[PDB]
Ligand binder design. Structure first.
Ligand SMILES: Nc1ncnc2c1ncn2[C@@H]1O[C@H](COP(=O)(O)OP(=O)(O)OP(=O)(O)O)[C@@H](O)[C@H]1O
Ligand SMILES: Nc1ncnc2c1ncn2[C@@H]1O[C@H](COP(=O)(O)OP(=O)(O)O)[C@@H](O)[C@H]1O
Ligand SMILES: [Mg+2]
Ligand SMILES: [Mg+2]
Lengths: 421, 50, 542, 141, 53
């Protein structure tokens, strides 16, 4: 067969014409809406921006998840790993972030909007199709590019679909806008790269992976950067997803991406089947770059929340299950269980950040101690509905709980009808 | 004495079932790493000859 | 002009073969490819025979055609060295990447040397205090020795090596060198902006008063750049040691990336792989690099290297080879970090050649061996306490458990670089305050205090002041009932006029991403190149 | 140092220099065995000679075996250590006693080079890292 | 191990005697065939022994 060279390095179409389009791992659309129109071709293999080209992560990226935006805060330009077992809510966290950017893009100005790219590596084609229906019936598809190399696609297509989707996401970073790239199942891509490496008869290393499987993910994730002010100031936020086996995070690819990304979101499988959804392992999940890029006010009240949940994990599984009960720290066991039920959240419903910090101010100050633990998800839903909506405009605009505001907050929080009790 | 031993030995089966469940996964990771390790030793010795 | 110019024979990833018709370059010699998009430097690694050399590229090889002219420089990779590199960031090949102009070099030194000889070795075991309790007591650091920080991806090897920069580099009188090898480029920008505000690095006309040289070969670089940027970082440090006679600090953030990047190229050099998948030359590549970092008779290099263990496996051959090249190892543990103890140093895995009673004194030595005695005795009871609880132990062993549970909280310490994300301020602990503080918990002087009073405190003064605060605060439940009364007409206006004093931001529909976008016309049919090189569509045959 | 010779093929030396330094030092110690005197040789890091010998054979393209070691890596240490003998009266009566040193990984005595030298040498001096931290120095098991 | 067996097979067959053949470490017969097996051009079997073990 005749092989023709196209004349150029491996490129994907990038630009504003990629928004709304479902795309394979090479650039050509698969949703059946015609070719990409308002678009231009750029390389999938670009060297990441250097040291001078970057600046410190300052602005927050609100996920819409209560257990994320309070405890593991994520700034623009960060790389945050979503790691856990299979069916622990990995996507439940990633696709709540994309939906929440649709709600935030209609309220922020033009240069503050976040354009999302979702790369699906090795997924079922039905779950990709069920996700585009979710992004269309929400309206999130207007700001979302969808790259999909499914399980039936070839292994070079799954190898290249993160790099294809990053180059489509690097259009927004290099033009001063803000991007959000999600590599669903980061380990998958490494399995598809392990397939190409062993079929090229390259010497396998640990777990039969090649020696450059660190460089497979380090090259990809260093392109998520917050650029300096002489480069537009645009950012790119990565959410790689790694599936672990039996909760083992000392695996080869798992410890690779942990030593690449800034923080991690450990989703525990034990909390997920105990009803705690999202099942954020609060002891292991860190974010030390987006902690400075946190919403103030939320930073004021979640310093108390993760401090009270810290001593709640000192009463973990030996409340009276191990030897005995002391009944003096009964208060923290009946408060850490309230902060646990506060952070539970249904799927496909992301909360604005100004309504999250009032729900934590209602819980960490003690306005829900009378409420029994069975009806706290009903209590905080009654807190946001019955407290007047003028207080959410103050806390969003001032950006902090001002000393004028917590007086009217504590006034409005004592006149709500909590269920039961 | 008999009723606190009945509770101290329920806490011992729970502790030696959590220790056994964790050490089974530690064996299964070391089982999977073992079959991968000696198989790589055979291919590296066969690619040197073939 | 046709001679002394080879052409690219074949390109396998980062490994390029160049055929020289007239004369071949030496091994370790550097080459230059003409007509690349960036400055592509190849370094000759093997003479393959048939007039071909085998090279490793220092940048990406994408865009290389197998006829490209490659010029021999007649020398290895030469980088600028001297005091003009202070306050500058260099990459692997000595180019300035800090946008401050060219580097005012005192000399251009090759990055490849032999190790200094046996007659040029210094035997001077002097302590270097770091202010860290688990470091100053159990594995003290030599003032001119090699120091390893072994870690397992998230245990705190970079926060520890930044605290060592925060503690011993300011008190040092010499020049620091940071070799960032295969780490996050975000951390290289974090360290650069932290060293500028701290005055360690000064920009512009005040550049001569800088005390640090940054060399950065971070994890976005190809494996040829990450395999030689440690050699670039030594060469700046070897100039201050040999020529300037200074005492140099060398911080190498993850030296494992030197070993890992040599394994990514060794698959394509046609070698048979060694154990788990590393190169057959693991011990001599690491041993060739680590033997250049020594204290000689004309200068000392206090090197602190981070070592990454690949899957929390200390028996992996790349960390296991590094253990023999160090004077003080600080093995950090994943399981200590899950207890919340920071720094997560394993006290029964970290060793030092300085922990000898004829070097640190018999009073400091006997305390460290007593701390390690009851921590090993607590580890021997770890499964009896698990499957049977603490009620089955002896009354002389429950004193062993309670004391060892106290000192492993007392080895924890808050850092001055961890105060940004933990909130608690950093604690610098003196050496005599650590030996006296750990005598008291061993002898039994602090069996009164609880276990959590020792957690994250600096000195033995601070555990007594935290044991009071833990018992003032449980008495503070009965303290007072705080009422906030009569403030509504003092200074707080209202809710409704508070809404009228916010500033509405104009929300813009029609986001307008067509601004400054050129939108080249991508047609339907795949455009290819015919035999005359013109862009034509695909023919209608398969 | 009046009675001590030191052969040192360090880590910066080539792999055939570290491979040959136990044989270079044994030939120097065989002068005293073959002349009626008594020698004492310490092959410190004999686990590092086998790694240096593995590097040569893998780069001479000899096929690898257990942990990519050569097949004849038992003969590397068996022909070295059997030169440490006590000679007869007709050969002077001289002797040569060897102290090879093997480093294990996490106490794994079942390693490949470790089990070879255990089967070659007469005795063993096992040093455990958990007896070392209980105050027992030397940590003899 | 074949040289000493040949002496034991002469005392059994030709001399007709009862023989005692003491073989110290017949493992070293199998180990010595493994040290030449990759140099005879045989790809290795399980744990590291020859395919003809
Ligand atoms: N906050 C939540 N509340 C309730 N259900 C949830 C929540 N988050 C996720 N789920 C549900 O949990 C299940 C897990 O699906 P999900 O795609 O989130 O997991 P996953 O980790 O991506 O799984 P997989 O490994 O199969 O890709 C789904 O049925 C999802 O609807
Ligand atoms: N000294 C410390 N104090 C508090 N937390 C720490 C400390 N060191 C590490 N950590 C925690 O562990 C994480 C390790 O981060 P880092 O040191 O960058 O990782 P690595 O060891 O992989 O380089 C931090 O983000 C933080 O959550
Ligand atoms: Mg999923
Ligand atoms: Mg690091």
């Amino acid at each position: 067969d005749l092989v023709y060279r196209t004349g150029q390095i491996v490129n994907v179409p990038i630009g504003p014409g990629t928004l709304g389009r479902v795309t394979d791992g090479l650039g050509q659309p698969i949703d059946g809406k015609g070719p990409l129109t308002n678009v231009r071709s750029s390389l999938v293999e670009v060297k990441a921006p250097g040291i001078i080209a970057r600046q410190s992560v300052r602005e927050p990226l609100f996920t819409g998840v209560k257990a994320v935006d309070a405890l593991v805060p994520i700034g623009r330009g960060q790389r945050e790993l979503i790691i856990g077992d299979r069916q622990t809510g990995k996507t439940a966290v990633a696709i709540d972030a994309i939906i929440h950017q649709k709600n935030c893009n209609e309220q922020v100005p033009k240069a503050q909007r976040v354009y999302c790219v979702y790369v699906a590596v090795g997924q079922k084609r039905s779950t990709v199709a069920q996700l585009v229906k979710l992004f269309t019936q929400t309206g999130a598809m207007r700001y979302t590019i969808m790259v999909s190399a499914t399980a039936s696609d070839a292994a070079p297509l799954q190898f290249l679909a993160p790099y294809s989707g990053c180059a489509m996401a690097e259009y927004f970073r290099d033009t001063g806008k803000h991007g959000l790239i999600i590599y669903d199942d980061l380990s998958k891509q490494s399995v598809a790269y392990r397939q190409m490496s062993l079929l090229l008869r390259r010497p396998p290393g640990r777990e039969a992976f090649p020696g450059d499987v660190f460089y497979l993910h380090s090259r990809l994730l260093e392109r998520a950067a917050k650029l300096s002010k002489e480069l537009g100031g645009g950012s790119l936020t990565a959410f790689p997803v790694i599936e672990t086996q039996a909760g083992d995070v000392s695996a080869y690819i798992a410890t690779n991406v942990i030593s690449i990304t800034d923080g991690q979101i450990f989703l525990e499988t034990e909390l997920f089947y105990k009803g705690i959804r999202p099942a954020l392992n609060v002891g292991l999940s860190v974010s030390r770059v987006g902690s400075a890029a946190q919403f103030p006010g939320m930073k004021q009240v979640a310093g108390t929340l993760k401090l009270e949940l810290a001593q709640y994990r000192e009463v973990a599984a030996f409340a009276q299950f191990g030897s005995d009960l002391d009944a003096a720290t009964q208060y923290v066991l009946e408060r850490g269980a309230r902060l646990t039920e506060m952070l539970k959240q249904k799927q496909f419903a992301p909360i604005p950040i100004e309504r999250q910090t009032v729900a934590v101010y209602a819980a960490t100050k003690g306005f829900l101690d009378k409420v029994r633990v069975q009806d706290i998800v009903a209590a905080e839903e009654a807190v946001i509905s019955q407290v007047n909506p003028a207080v959410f405009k103050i806390l969003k605009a001032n950006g902090k709980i001002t000393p004028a505001l917590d007086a009217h907050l504590k006034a409005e929080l004592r006149k709500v009808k909590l269920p039961g009790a | 004495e008999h009723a606190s031993r009945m509770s101290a030995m329920e806490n011992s089966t729970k502790s030696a079932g959590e220790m056994l469940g964790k050490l089974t996964l530690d064996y299964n990771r070391k089982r999977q790493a073992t079959i991968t390790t000696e198989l790589i030793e055979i291919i590296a010795g066969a690619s040197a000859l073939m | 002009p046709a001679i002394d110019a080879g052409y690219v024979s074949q390109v396998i990833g980062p490994v390029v073969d160049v055929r020289f018709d007239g004369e071949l370059p030496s091994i370790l010699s550097s080459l230059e490819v003409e007509g690349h998009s960036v400055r592509l430097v190849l370094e000759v690694a093997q003479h393959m025979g048939d007039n071909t050399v085998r090279c490793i590229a220092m940048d990406s090889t994408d865009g290389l055609v197998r006829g490209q002219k490659v010029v021999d420089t007649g020398s290895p990779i030469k980088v600028p060295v001297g005091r003009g590199t202070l306050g500058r960031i260099m990459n692997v090949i000595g180019e300035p990447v800090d946008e401050q102009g060219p580097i005012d070099a005192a000399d251009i030194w090759s990055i490849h040397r032999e190790a200094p000889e046996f007659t040029e070795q210094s035997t001077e075991q002097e302590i270097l205090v770091t202010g860290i309790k688990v470091v100053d007591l159990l594995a003290p650091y030599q003032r001119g020795g090699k120091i390893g920080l072994f870690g397992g991806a998230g245990v705190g090897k970079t926060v520890l090596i930044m605290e060592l920069i925060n503690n011993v580099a300011k008190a040092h009188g010499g020049f620091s060198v940071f070799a960032g090898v295969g780490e996050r480029t975000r951390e290289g920008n974090d360290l650069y902006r932290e060293m500028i505000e701290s005055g360690v690095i000064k920009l512009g006309a005040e550049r001569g008063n800088s005390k640090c040289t940054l060399v950065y070969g971070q994890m976005n670089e190809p494996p040829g750049a990450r395999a030689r940027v440690a050699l670039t970082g030594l060469t700046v440090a070897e100039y201050f040691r040999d020529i300037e006679g200074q005492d140099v600090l060398l911080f190498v953030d993850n030296i494992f990336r030197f070993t890992q990047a040599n394994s990514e190229v060794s698959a394509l050099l046609g070698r048979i792989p060694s154990a788990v998948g590393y190169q057959p030359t693991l011990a001599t590549d690491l041993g060739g690099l680590q033997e250049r970092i020594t204290t000689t008779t004309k200068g000392s290099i206090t090197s602190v290297q981070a070592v990454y263990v690949p899957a929390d496996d200390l028996t992996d051959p790349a960390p296991a080879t590094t253990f023999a090249h160090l004077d003080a190892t600080t093995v950090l543990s994943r399981s200590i970090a899950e207890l919340g103890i920071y720094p997560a140093v394993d006290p029964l895995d970290s060793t030092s050649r300085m922990l000898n009673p004829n070097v640190i004194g018999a009073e400091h030595y006997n305390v460290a061996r007593g701390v390690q005695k009851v921590l090993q005795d607590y580890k021997n009871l770890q499964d009896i306490i698990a499957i049977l609880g603490m009620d089955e132990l002896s009354e002389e062993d429950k004193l062993t458990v309670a004391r060892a549970r106290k000192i492993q909280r007392f080895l924890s310490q808050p850092f001055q670089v961890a105060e940004v994300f933990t909130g608690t301020p950093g604690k610098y602990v003196d050496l005599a305050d650590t030996i006296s503080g750990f005598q008291g918990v061993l002898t039994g002087k602090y069996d009164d205090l609880p276990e959590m009073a020792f957690y994250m405190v600096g000195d033995i003064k601070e555990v007594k002041e935290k044991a009071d605060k833990m018992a003032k605060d449980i008495a503070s439940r009965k303290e007072a009932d705080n009422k906030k009364v009569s403030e509504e007409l003092k200074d707080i206006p209202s809710l409704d006029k508070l809404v009228s004093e916010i500033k509405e931001v104009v929300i813009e529909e029609d986001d307008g991403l067509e601004e400054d976008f050129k939108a080249e016309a991508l047609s339907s049919e795949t455009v290819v190149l015919n035999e005359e090189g013109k862009s034509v569509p695909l023919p209608k045959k398969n």
